[PDB]
Amino acid sequence: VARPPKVQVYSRHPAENGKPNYLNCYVSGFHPPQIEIDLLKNGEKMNAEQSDLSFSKDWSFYLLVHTEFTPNAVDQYSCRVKHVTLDKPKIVKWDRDH
Amino acid sequence: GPHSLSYFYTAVSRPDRGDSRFIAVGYVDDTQFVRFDNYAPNPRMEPRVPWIQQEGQEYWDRETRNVKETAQTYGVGLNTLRGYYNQSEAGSHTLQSMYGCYLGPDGLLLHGYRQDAYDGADYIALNEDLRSWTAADMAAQITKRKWEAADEAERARSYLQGLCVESLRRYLEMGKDTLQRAEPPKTHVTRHPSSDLGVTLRCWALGFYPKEISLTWQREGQDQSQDMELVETRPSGDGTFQKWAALVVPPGEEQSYTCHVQHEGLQEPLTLRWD
Amino acid sequence: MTAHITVPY
């Protein structure tokens, strides 16, 4: 059985424009483990770290993809997930009010 | 709750690359402290927090040798289960294991576990008494017969009652500043007008450890519990966690609502109120 | 520290 990923996108600290911060895309609950997670800045892929593959007590996998960033007023951030359960990639926009 | 040491193994067959990938992660409580990934440069057990870096080279050497042999066993294991299930060689499959020990008040094992899943479904597990196994299907019954003939349950029990809790107790000492001194949440409430007759209040808890926490909303005494949207607790990126809980309230009243925060890092439950 | 996990499936 294949389980689709759940996706949260958020900053490590409360976002304030001009102040350096960290952008997180937490992807969880999925199976099989093959997955492609990209943080996007204005639609374009960012360089980011990805955590070591781990899984929850129900066997479903989770990964954290993160990079440093400095939010401003104009730039739009999102995280885009591809997985066998998804016909089209799942895109979650970053909202500083999460 | 009781402290724990746990390892999480994921083996994935990769016929497109001619091999299998094996990853191991180790946790003390909610803290990942080691990893192994045989698709990474020079596959080995590697540190993932500062406090384990005080282990000497023989520690790393033994962990690396041991996990390399496990990856070998799991590569053949993926081969073997594919045969048990009459499956073709072209597809990728997953073999997972998790095992670990919880620390009792005497420094001995409180309870421990060892469990497997194949392709995301339970396959075999060590029972609560650490002396017997439960097989999910006819395939895992084959594995069960092999492990019984090899007295694997005694090997498991010994590990869980011995090396596992002893290593746990040592790690708890080395990482005391984070593993045994809880970091309390940083808390604030934000306000979002959301409709003519509703304002959204969001109670944030940020940067806390361990990950267990309680956030609830209460208007003058009674707990709101039909629809206060609460996100799954999520990692901050620095080894701490964050969560929020939000509810919609009438514009007449925001001051009358109280967010209550329970966490081990707070000597006493915290209250937060308006925006 | 990890367990000795090498008994075949």
Number of domains of chain B: 2
Biggest interface, chains and residue tallies: A-B, 30 and 34 residues
| Helical run tally of chain A | 0
Radius of gyration of chain B, CA atoms, in whole angstroms: 23 Å
PDB class: structural protein
Keywords: MHC class I structure, A single-amino acid mutation, Peptide motifs, Random peptide library
Assembly: trimeric
Entry title: Crystal structure of pSLA-1*0401(R156A) complex with FMDV-derived epitope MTAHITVPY
How would you portray this structure in words?
Chain B: It is a single-pass type I membrane protein. Chain B: Keywords: Glycoprotein, Immunity, Membrane, MHC I, Signal, Transmembrane, Transmembrane helix. Chain B: Disulfide bonds join 101-164, 203-259. The complex is a heterotrimer of chains A (98), B (275) and C (9). Chain A has 98 residues and is mainly β. Chain A has strands at residues 6-11, 21-30, 36-41, 44-45, 49-50, 54-55, 61-69, 77-82, 90-93. In chain A, strands 1, 2, 5, 6 and 7 form a 5-stranded antiparallel beta sheet that branches. Chain B folds into 2 domains: 1-181, no CATH class; 182-272, no CATH class. In chain B, 24% of the residues lie in helices and 40% in strands. Chain B has 4 helices and 17 strands. In chain B, strand 6 and strand 7 (121-126) form a beta hairpin. The two termini of chain B are 34 Å apart. Classes of the chains: A mainly beta (98), B alpha+beta (275), C little secondary structure (9). The A-B interface holds A 1-3, 6, 8, 10, 12-14, 22, 24, 26, 28, 31-34, 51-55, 57, 59-61, 64, 66, 97-98 and B 8, 10, 12, 23, 25, 32, 35, 37, 48, 92, 94, 96, 98, 117, 119-122, 188, 190, 192, 202, 204, 206-207, 231-232, 234-238, 242, 244.
